[PDB]
């Protein structure tokens, strides 16, 4: 079953749960009042976002049945964010501990300092629901 | 593609006499339904449900370019199959096209119009209602559906 | 979620930021109006879909001679001891065999699965 | 008729009402064009039954096709509609009684004939649409007996479940005694039979 | 007080013919018609037919306020009719029949796209995104 | 000052009317007597928490019709007229929809037979001939 | 079919108007269907009895007859019409 869990193609899609565009200019105050109990851990020591981010966010809910009938973790799921889009994508994502996978992203500052700040992360999320193979 | 991957799936209307079968939201400009909640409206009878609202969504941001039941009309008319020379040639081309060919069993009469989009607008709804999966799909094979 | 139109020409309001306050605003396209958001949510999709069918089952059905009934399920609002089941009907359900009863009584529409 | 009689029965007129009444109300449709809407399907479908029944203002190859889960009532009048007659039940009982039995075993010399139980409401022509919505005993001995209470609300009852059969198809003797192939190839051959 | 069980029975009158014809104006709730602001108003048939069979052009204040344009009821009423029931003081209903429906419905005023501009810029429909950029554009 | 400009006293006295939808035969009868103006009375009854309206035609005219009314909120309906002497006006606001129908029912579908009948009789139907035409 | 389709048929047809200046107007007014009729080569007409049409191999068939209405207009305010019975 683990080489089948390798050879079966498996896309963000299957493992999500849900997905939704938040806006939440300031992340020290995450409009999504139970990310700041998690969130906080990040921002508490941000790095190459201190200076600036895009004010736009992006937050995915990932099934924990399907990640753990699939062996996946949010470990490698933001590596190959990351191992996709490049540094494009900011990715932060909540402890295993928490009753819900969540992944918070945001674009990079250079880019907010490529279509657009907002409606580009339609084109990310359908992208990483799609094409992006974990 | 991704803005066409952002989009997502979007609806078009396949009128007779028409080359090229326009988004469905000109439609129901062309008919002279202008602002987008009397579009909706007629297609989505609870606001309250965001699925249905989200699904149709693309129609409206393909339309957005035609905003004026005259321009829509040029635009069915520049898309008719015999085009029309001129602006005027053309909209009163469109015109007969959605007096006479489209729908003529729910009305023929100049004033017919109004209740041409409320079926149009059924039509869209029971397309959205087989798309989100709250009807089956019709079966070609049922006796009940034959003549 | 919800939907906002433009109050002058009922067209369809966007959602927009104002980088000179950075706060999210709706703002009507074609139309130079925007308006206060509240609920700081754009978008929003359930992949997995879990939402309740009673919410989608209609009263009504209780009124269906093809329908089976059965009175080993009382109504809780009302006690009718008959009542209607039936399963999802939804096609997106992969998994739609649980039944979902709806009172016969008129004028209840209480609704329940088991 | 239909569309004149649904503006009686305050069948709401589409030109006449906002688009916010069309949530709880049912659409009304007749040969496929939305006429309205209605408010009370259930005393507008049980007033078109008693009108067909009654043969008082519409005629009895009318289909009426009331879709409860989608709030939609179907009325269609249009020609080459499959349709069959279908006994009554109600109260889980035939409105079929000996009387009209009687009535037609005397029917020489007595012009009571088949019309008489269409026009008395026993019996009513159910097309391929509405029988979606129909609840049919097969038979009255032992479908809708309370001893089964296998459905409580059977609407029509099979006149003779034979009937199913065509011209050809009911030549063969004891068909439900044979393998379905060997009934299609009778078929064929009592057409190329000699008489 | 009677209020609570008041009835009321009145004589109904039916003038053969009036001076003026009885026409019935309807407006949607999303319009929002205000008639207090209404200081001027103008109802008067269109020009798009270049006459009693043709659509109503309805502005108030002029060119200031809103338009509306009033459509004809394409549904005839062939088992109705309808009656305008209004007060009189001598204890009798006066009703007067609708000669005439007219649908109206608001017409927005803004720098809409002309056949020519929407002719281009139906261009962008191949690639459009941002679609602010195009008012900002025109 | 124009020929199309509305006298909207109607609408600034606020005059409140009444739409009523009452059957062609009723109507009928009334706009053959409206010389008359006696072609009948409008009763209308309130009690605690119901009320009735109704209608008796005159004996003569003839020779009870209770009315169900209908809610007026889901759309604003406004009465206007145009005078012969091009002058617009508008009367009032419905504020009262109400529909006729009729008390019985079993005798009332015997006009609608004749009604059907009479009906009938425009529609032409080809007719067969006994003899060839010579 | 007979009784109303061919009525029907006739009667929706749009009245054929000419124009040269005179101005000529047709409107089909009434259909009959003469029993099944044959004509002999004398031109006698005579019932056709199935039984002869399928020995005969004629054609079972019943003469269709429609009753026009022609006006005329001459520009001269005047019309005249004249009906052409069982045509
Ligand atoms: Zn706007
Ligand atoms: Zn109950």
Redesign the pocket.
């Given at each position: 079953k683990d080489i089948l869990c390798r050879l079966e193609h498996t896309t963000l899609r299957k493992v999500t749960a849900n997905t939704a565009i938040y806006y939440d200019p300031n992340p020290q105050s995450t409009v999504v009042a139970e990310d700041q109990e998690w969130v906080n851990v990040y921002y508490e020591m941000p790095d190459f976002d201190v200076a600036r981010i895009s004010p736009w966010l992006l937050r995915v809910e990932l099934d924990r049945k399907h990640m753990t009938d699939r062996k996946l973790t949010m470990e490698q799921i933001a590596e190959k964010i990351n191992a996709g889009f490049g540094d494009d994508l900011n990715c932060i994502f909540n402890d295993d501990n928490a009753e819900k996978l969540v992944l918070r992203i945001r674009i990079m500052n250079s880019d907010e300092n490529k279509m657009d700040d907002d409606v580009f992360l339609r084109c990310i999320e359908s992208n990483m629901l799609t094409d992006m193979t974990l | 593609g991704a803005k066409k991957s952002a989009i997502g799936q979007r609806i078009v209307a396949t009128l007779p006499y028409i080359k090229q079968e326009v988004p469905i939201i000109i439609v129901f400009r062309a008919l002279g339904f202008v602002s987008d909640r009397d579009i909706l409206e007629h297609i989505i009878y609870d606001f309250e449900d965001p699925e249905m609202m989200e699904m149709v969504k693309p129609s409206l941001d393909e339309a957005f370019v035609i905003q004026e039941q005259n321009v829509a009309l040029n635009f069915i008319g520049s898309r008719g199959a015999k085009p029309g020379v001129t602006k005027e040639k053309r909209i009163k081309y469109a015109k007969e096209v959605l007096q006479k060919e489209m729908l003529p069993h729910v009305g023929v009469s100049d004033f017919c119009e109004t209740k041409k989009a409320y079926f149009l607008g059924y039509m869209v709804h029971r397309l959205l209602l087989a798309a989100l999966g709250r009807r089956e799909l019709d079966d070609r094979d049922h006796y009940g559906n034959k003549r | 979620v919800g939907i906002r139109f433009c109050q002058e020409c009922n067209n369809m309001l966007y959602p927009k930021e104002d980088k000179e306050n950075r706060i999210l605003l709706y703002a009507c396209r074609n139309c130079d109006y925007q308006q206060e958001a509240d609920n700081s949510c754009i978008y929003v999709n359930k992949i997995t879909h879990e939402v309740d069918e009673l919410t989608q089952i209609i009263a009504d059905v209780s009124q269906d001679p093809t329908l089976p009934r059965t009175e080993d399920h009382p109504?809780?609002?009302?006690?009718?001891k008959e009542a209607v089941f039936f399963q999802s009907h939804s096609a997106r359900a992969e998994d739609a065999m649980r039944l979902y009863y709806v009172?016969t009584?008129p004028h209840?529409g209480?609704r329940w699965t088991e | 008729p239909i569309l004149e009689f649904l503006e009686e029965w305050s069948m709401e007129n589409l030109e006449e009402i906002s688009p916010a009444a069309i949530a709880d109300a049912t659409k009304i449709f007749v040969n496929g064009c939305w006429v309205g809407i209605h408010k009370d399907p259930e005393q507008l479908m049980n007033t078109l039954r008693k009108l067909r029944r009654q043969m008082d203002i519409i005629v009895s190859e009318v289909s009426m096709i009331r879709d409860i889960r989608e709030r939609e009532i179907r009325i269609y009048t249009d020609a080459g509609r499959i349709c069959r007659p279908l006994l009554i039940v109600e109260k889980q009982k035939l409105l079929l009684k000996k009387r009209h039995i009687d009535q037609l075993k005397e029917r020489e010399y007595n012009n009571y004939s088949w019309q008489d139980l269409v026009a008395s409401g026993v019996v009513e022509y159910i097309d391929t649409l509405e029988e979606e919505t129909v609840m049919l005993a097969m038979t009255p001995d032992d479908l809708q007996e309370k001893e089964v209470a296998y459905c409580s609300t059977y609407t029509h009852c099979e006149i003779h479940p034979s009937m199913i059969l065509g011209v050809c198809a009911s030549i063969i003797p004891f068909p439900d005694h044979n393998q379905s192939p060997r009934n299609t190839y009778q078929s064929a051959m009592g057409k190329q039979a000699m008489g | 007080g009677p209020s609570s069980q008041n009835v009321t029975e009145y004589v109904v009158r039916v003038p053969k013919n009036t001076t003026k014809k009885y026409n019935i104006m309807a407006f949607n709730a999303a319009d929002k018609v205000n008639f207090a602001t209404w200081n001027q108003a103008r109802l008067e048939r269109d020009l798009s037919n270049k006459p009693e069979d043709q659509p109503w052009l309805l502005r108030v204040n002029g060119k200031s306020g809103r338009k509306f344009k009033g459509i004809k009821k394409g549904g005839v009423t062939e088992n109705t009719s309808y009656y305008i029931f209004t007060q009189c003081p001598d204890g009798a209903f006066e009703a007067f029949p609708v000669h005439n429906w007219y649908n109206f419905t608001p017409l927005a005023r803004h720098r809409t796209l002309t056949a020519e501009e929407a002719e281009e810029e139906w261009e962008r429909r191949n690639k459009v995104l941002n679609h602010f950029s195009i008012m900002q554009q025109r | 000052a124009e020929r199309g400009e509305l006298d909207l006293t109607g609408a600034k006295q606020n005059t409140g009317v009444w739409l009523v939808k009452v059957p062609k035969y009723l109507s009928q009868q009334w706009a053959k007597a409206s010389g008359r103006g006696e072609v009948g009375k409008l009763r209308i009854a309130k009690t605690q928490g119901r009320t009735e309206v109704s209608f008796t035609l005159n004996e003569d005219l003839a020779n009870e019709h209770p009315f169900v009314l209908q809610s007026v909120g889901g759309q604003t309906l406004t009465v206007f007229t145009e005078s012969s002497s091009d002058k617009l006006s508008l009367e009032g606001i419905v504020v009262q929809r109400a529909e006729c129908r009729p008390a019985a029912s079993e005798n009332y579908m015997r006009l609608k037979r004749l009604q059907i009948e009479e009906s009938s009789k425009p529609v032409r139907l080809s007719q067969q001939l006994d003899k060839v035409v010579t | 079919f007979i009784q109303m389709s061919v009525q029907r048929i006739v009667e929706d047809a749009p009245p054929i108007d000419l124009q040269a200046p005179p101005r000529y107007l047709l409107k089909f007014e009434q259909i009959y269907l003469s029993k099944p009729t044959h004509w002999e080569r004398d031109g006698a007409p005579s019932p056709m009895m199935p039984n002869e049409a399928r020995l005969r191999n004629l054609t079972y068939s019943a003469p269709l007859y429609v009753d026009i209405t022609k006006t005329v207009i001459k520009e001269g305010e005047e019309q005249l019409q004249t009906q052409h019975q069982k045509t």
């Open positions: - | - | 109504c809780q609002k009302c006690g009718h009172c009584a209840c209480h | - | - | - | -």
